[PDB]
């Protein structure tokens, strides 16, 4: 089996210590600030709505608590992942300070891992955003992160926000030169970026009408 890690929401010394442990154990770490779809596992210090966490869920990666690696260190090899998944009872029942956002994030990680891995062995490639064709109009500080997140779950991110693209688009997300009302007039879902995360975080997410951008309202 392949053991290609990323790391997220960890102290620098934790990251250094774990990079060394993972290599010692025979795995690899992708040391990038951004999400990389080549990875198979991620160890997360704190479940957050950041690029690595959400994109790992969208693709159904193993999303693991740090005690995983400590059990690996003891065993002298990579142990079974199940009891160390953030969404598992073994982790959730023992930890404190987990707020509702984090619990939802942890549970979603496990749920999407299960869903996607049953489709892999069935021979289909299909993340959380499969079938989505997306126009992004988001803060430049954040756009590339959303694009990778969306792509990780199998969405097509369309190039640009020109009106001609609206007929190909299913979703237009914004958190803010884009003619939104024009897209809405064509029944493109014109939605706040929060929908992306809640879509992953929730078994049954609220109706899209709850996330409508201002120009798309009634």
């Amino acid at each position: 089996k392949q053991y290609i890690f990323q790391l997220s929401s960890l102290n620098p010394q934790e990251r250094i210590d774990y990079c060394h442990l993972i290599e010692k154990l025979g795995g690899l770490v992708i040391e990038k600030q951004c999400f990389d779809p080549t990875c198979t596992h991620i160890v997360v210090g704190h479940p957050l709505r950041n690029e690595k966490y959400l994109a790992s869920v969208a693709a159904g990666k193993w999303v693991l608590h740090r005690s995983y690696l400590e059990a690996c260190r003891t065993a002298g090899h990579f142990v079974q992942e199940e009891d160390y998944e953030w969404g598992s009872s073994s982790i959730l029942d023992v930890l404190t300070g987990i707020n509702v956002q984090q619990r939802r994030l942890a549970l979603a990680a496990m749920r999407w891992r299960k869903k996607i891995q049953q489709r892999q062995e069935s021979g289909i490639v299909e993340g959380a955003f499969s079938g989505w064709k997306v126009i992004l109009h988001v803060d430049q500080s954040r756009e590339a992160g959303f694009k990778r997140l969306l792509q990780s779950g199998g969405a097509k991110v369309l190039p640009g926000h020109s009106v001609p693209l609206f007929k190909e688009a299913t979703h237009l997300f914004s958190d803010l030169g884009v003619n939104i009302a024009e897209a809405a007039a064509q029944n493109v879902y014109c939605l706040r970026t929060e929908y992306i995360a809640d879509y992953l975080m929730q078994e049954s997410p609220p109706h899209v009408e709850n996330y409508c951008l201002p120009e798309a309202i009634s």
């Binding site: 997220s8 102290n11 620098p12 950041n50 690029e51 690595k52 929060e194 995360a197």
Partner: peptide, 10 residues
């Protein structure tokens, strides 16, 4: 932490 990757949200 300053060393945790910022969220994609306010």
């Amino acid at each position: 932490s300053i060393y945790f990757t910022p969220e994609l949200y306010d």
